[PDB]
PDB file of C-alpha atoms in Angstrom:
ATOM      1  CA  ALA Y   1     175.899  86.837 265.196  1.00 41.62           C
ATOM      2  CA  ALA Y   2     178.960  85.549 267.021  1.00 40.42           C
ATOM      3  CA  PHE Y   3     181.417  88.275 268.031  1.00 39.74           C
ATOM      4  CA  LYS Y   4     185.119  87.613 267.939  1.00 39.16           C
ATOM      5  CA  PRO Y   5     186.563  88.719 271.289  1.00 37.95           C
ATOM      6  CA  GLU Y   6     189.412  90.899 270.060  1.00 41.08           C
ATOM      7  CA  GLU Y   7     187.159  92.521 267.457  1.00 41.89           C
ATOM      8  CA  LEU Y   8     184.515  93.304 270.086  1.00 43.57           C
ATOM      9  CA  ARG Y   9     187.205  94.742 272.362  1.00 44.87           C
ATOM     10  CA  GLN Y  10     188.616  96.889 269.531  1.00 45.13           C
ATOM     11  CA  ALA Y  11     185.179  98.245 268.586  1.00 45.59           C
ATOM     12  CA  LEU Y  12     184.182  99.153 272.145  1.00 44.57           C
ATOM     13  CA  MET Y  13     187.513 100.288 273.622  1.00 42.09           C
ATOM     14  CA  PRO Y  14     187.372 103.882 272.204  1.00 45.58           C
ATOM     15  CA  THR Y  15     184.089 104.423 274.029  1.00 42.13           C
ATOM     16  CA  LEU Y  16     185.657 103.295 277.333  1.00 44.56           C
ATOM     17  CA  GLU Y  17     188.704 105.505 276.694  1.00 42.78           C
ATOM     18  CA  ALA Y  18     186.380 108.490 276.127  1.00 44.01           C
ATOM     19  CA  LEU Y  19     184.864 108.002 279.566  1.00 45.76           C
ATOM     20  CA  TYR Y  20     188.145 107.365 281.365  1.00 49.60           C
ATOM     21  CA  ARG Y  21     189.919 110.428 279.872  1.00 47.06           C
ATOM     22  CA  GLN Y  22     187.349 113.036 281.028  1.00 45.58           C
ATOM     23  CA  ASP Y  23     189.154 115.252 283.564  1.00 46.73           C
ATOM     24  CA  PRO Y  24     187.845 115.876 286.120  1.00 45.00           C
ATOM     25  CA  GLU Y  25     184.576 114.001 285.512  1.00 44.48           C
ATOM     26  CA  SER Y  26     185.977 110.451 285.346  1.00 45.80           C
ATOM     27  CA  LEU Y  27     187.894 110.752 288.632  1.00 47.99           C
ATOM     28  CA  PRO Y  28     185.257 109.240 291.008  1.00 50.61           C
ATOM     29  CA  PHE Y  29     184.746 106.343 288.548  1.00 46.93           C
ATOM     30  CA  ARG Y  30     188.272 105.179 287.725  1.00 45.79           C
ATOM     31  CA  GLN Y  31     188.452 102.673 290.652  1.00 46.00           C
ATOM     32  CA  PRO Y  32     185.938 100.621 292.669  1.00 50.30           C
ATOM     33  CA  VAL Y  33     184.183 102.476 295.487  1.00 54.01           C
ATOM     34  CA  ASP Y  34     186.037 101.586 298.716  1.00 49.13           C
ATOM     35  CA  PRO Y  35     183.529 102.337 301.503  1.00 47.59           C
ATOM     36  CA  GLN Y  36     186.139 101.937 304.229  1.00 45.53           C
ATOM     37  CA  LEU Y  37     188.532 104.503 302.796  1.00 41.35           C
ATOM     38  CA  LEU Y  38     185.611 106.794 301.892  1.00 37.54           C
ATOM     39  CA  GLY Y  39     184.016 106.518 305.352  1.00 35.53           C
ATOM     40  CA  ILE Y  40     180.636 105.454 303.928  1.00 33.68           C
ATOM     41  CA  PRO Y  41     179.603 102.119 305.486  1.00 32.90           C
ATOM     42  CA  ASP Y  42     176.087 102.405 304.054  1.00 33.59           C
ATOM     43  CA  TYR Y  43     177.403 102.158 300.473  1.00 36.54           C
ATOM     44  CA  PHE Y  44     177.116  98.390 299.897  1.00 37.42           C
ATOM     45  CA  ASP Y  45     173.696  98.430 301.610  1.00 37.00           C
ATOM     46  CA  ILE Y  46     172.417 100.731 298.850  1.00 41.00           C
ATOM     47  CA  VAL Y  47     174.568  99.630 295.908  1.00 42.43           C
ATOM     48  CA  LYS Y  48     174.213  95.850 295.606  1.00 40.72           C
ATOM     49  CA  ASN Y  49     176.122  95.500 292.285  1.00 39.68           C
ATOM     50  CA  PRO Y  50     179.070  97.917 292.250  1.00 36.34           C
ATOM     51  CA  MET Y  51     180.715  98.800 288.953  1.00 35.13           C
ATOM     52  CA  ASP Y  52     183.460 101.176 287.855  1.00 33.69           C
ATOM     53  CA  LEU Y  53     185.630 101.970 284.819  1.00 34.00           C
ATOM     54  CA  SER Y  54     188.600  99.849 285.928  1.00 33.35           C
ATOM     55  CA  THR Y  55     186.395  96.805 286.286  1.00 35.31           C
ATOM     56  CA  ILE Y  56     184.778  97.410 282.885  1.00 34.28           C
ATOM     57  CA  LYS Y  57     188.303  97.689 281.388  1.00 31.87           C
ATOM     58  CA  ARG Y  58     189.383  94.386 282.944  1.00 33.57           C
ATOM     59  CA  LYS Y  59     186.212  92.691 281.648  1.00 35.57           C
ATOM     60  CA  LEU Y  60     186.703  94.166 278.142  1.00 35.19           C
ATOM     61  CA  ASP Y  61     190.327  92.923 278.088  1.00 36.13           C
ATOM     62  CA  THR Y  62     189.512  89.353 279.290  1.00 39.28           C
ATOM     63  CA  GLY Y  63     186.664  88.149 277.102  1.00 37.76           C
ATOM     64  CA  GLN Y  64     183.905  88.706 279.672  1.00 35.08           C
ATOM     65  CA  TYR Y  65     181.540  90.531 277.234  1.00 34.37           C
ATOM     66  CA  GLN Y  66     180.286  88.108 274.563  1.00 32.69           C
ATOM     67  CA  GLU Y  67     177.880  90.674 273.077  1.00 30.80           C
ATOM     68  CA  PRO Y  68     178.037  94.493 273.012  1.00 30.35           C
ATOM     69  CA  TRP Y  69     174.845  94.855 275.091  1.00 25.39           C
ATOM     70  CA  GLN Y  70     176.642  93.278 278.074  1.00 26.23           C
ATOM     71  CA  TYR Y  71     179.244  96.066 278.008  1.00 22.36           C
ATOM     72  CA  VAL Y  72     176.533  98.736 277.598  1.00 25.24           C
ATOM     73  CA  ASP Y  73     174.641  97.276 280.584  1.00 26.21           C
ATOM     74  CA  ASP Y  74     177.729  97.513 282.849  1.00 28.58           C
ATOM     75  CA  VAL Y  75     178.354 101.156 281.861  1.00 25.63           C
ATOM     76  CA  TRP Y  76     174.745 102.034 282.735  1.00 25.92           C
ATOM     77  CA  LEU Y  77     175.009 100.037 285.953  1.00 26.27           C
ATOM     78  CA  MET Y  78     177.916 102.251 287.012  1.00 26.44           C
ATOM     79  CA  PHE Y  79     175.909 105.411 286.180  1.00 27.79           C
ATOM     80  CA  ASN Y  80     172.686 104.218 287.852  1.00 28.03           C
ATOM     81  CA  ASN Y  81     174.602 103.297 291.025  1.00 28.60           C
ATOM     82  CA  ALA Y  82     175.935 106.861 291.305  1.00 29.59           C
ATOM     83  CA  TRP Y  83     172.566 108.438 290.550  1.00 31.94           C
ATOM     84  CA  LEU Y  84     170.925 106.320 293.272  1.00 30.00           C
ATOM     85  CA  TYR Y  85     173.532 106.846 295.997  1.00 31.23           C
ATOM     86  CA  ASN Y  86     174.423 110.558 295.609  1.00 29.37           C
ATOM     87  CA  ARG Y  87     172.552 113.861 295.902  1.00 26.32           C
ATOM     88  CA  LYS Y  88     171.594 115.462 292.587  1.00 26.16           C
ATOM     89  CA  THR Y  89     173.787 118.472 293.092  1.00 25.83           C
ATOM     90  CA  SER Y  90     176.791 116.533 294.388  1.00 24.32           C
ATOM     91  CA  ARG Y  91     180.041 116.452 292.423  1.00 22.23           C
ATOM     92  CA  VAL Y  92     179.704 112.664 291.911  1.00 24.77           C
ATOM     93  CA  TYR Y  93     176.195 112.973 290.496  1.00 24.08           C
ATOM     94  CA  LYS Y  94     177.044 115.896 288.192  1.00 22.64           C
ATOM     95  CA  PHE Y  95     180.156 114.123 286.985  1.00 24.04           C
ATOM     96  CA  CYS Y  96     178.165 110.955 286.349  1.00 25.74           C
ATOM     97  CA  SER Y  97     175.731 112.935 284.205  1.00 28.73           C
ATOM     98  CA  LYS Y  98     178.616 114.267 282.115  1.00 30.54           C
ATOM     99  CA  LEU Y  99     179.970 110.732 281.542  1.00 32.31           C
ATOM    100  CA  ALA Y 100     176.518 109.563 280.511  1.00 30.27           C
ATOM    101  CA  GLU Y 101     176.298 112.365 277.913  1.00 29.62           C
ATOM    102  CA  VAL Y 102     179.719 111.369 276.562  1.00 26.13           C
ATOM    103  CA  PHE Y 103     178.748 107.724 276.469  1.00 28.78           C
ATOM    104  CA  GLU Y 104     175.478 108.338 274.604  1.00 29.61           C
ATOM    105  CA  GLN Y 105     177.352 110.301 271.897  1.00 26.86           C
ATOM    106  CA  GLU Y 106     180.145 107.700 271.564  1.00 23.58           C
ATOM    107  CA  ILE Y 107     178.157 104.431 271.819  1.00 22.71           C
ATOM    108  CA  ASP Y 108     175.461 105.211 269.275  1.00 21.12           C
ATOM    109  CA  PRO Y 109     177.577 105.201 266.073  1.00 19.49           C
ATOM    110  CA  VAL Y 110     179.518 102.173 267.328  1.00 20.43           C
ATOM    111  CA  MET Y 111     176.320 100.213 268.012  1.00 17.68           C
ATOM    112  CA  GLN Y 112     174.998 101.144 264.548  1.00 17.81           C
ATOM    113  CA  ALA Y 113     178.122  99.598 263.002  1.00 19.43           C
ATOM    114  CA  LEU Y 114     178.088  96.651 265.439  1.00 17.26           C
TER     115      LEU Y 114
END
């Protein structure tokens, strides 16, 4: 199957909106991690491929995902980065787990329908 770009964007966008609109759980994930402003110079040593919701949005809007699995892989990359870097009981980690629960519920019907 070849996906048309605007059709792929339209099918996947609601799932990205569901993540971004969680308050407060989306807040640590709406912008790229800035280790300088956060005072965490070790961050890029641990997280070699950063990802966040704003970057996923830009990629979804600009034809960077040719197949749905590429979008799904970036969402999981964002989650796995947070689960590697942060303590289990931290706010970031707990919020990440909430987003992952939302994403599982939203992505599965959409992937069924393609």
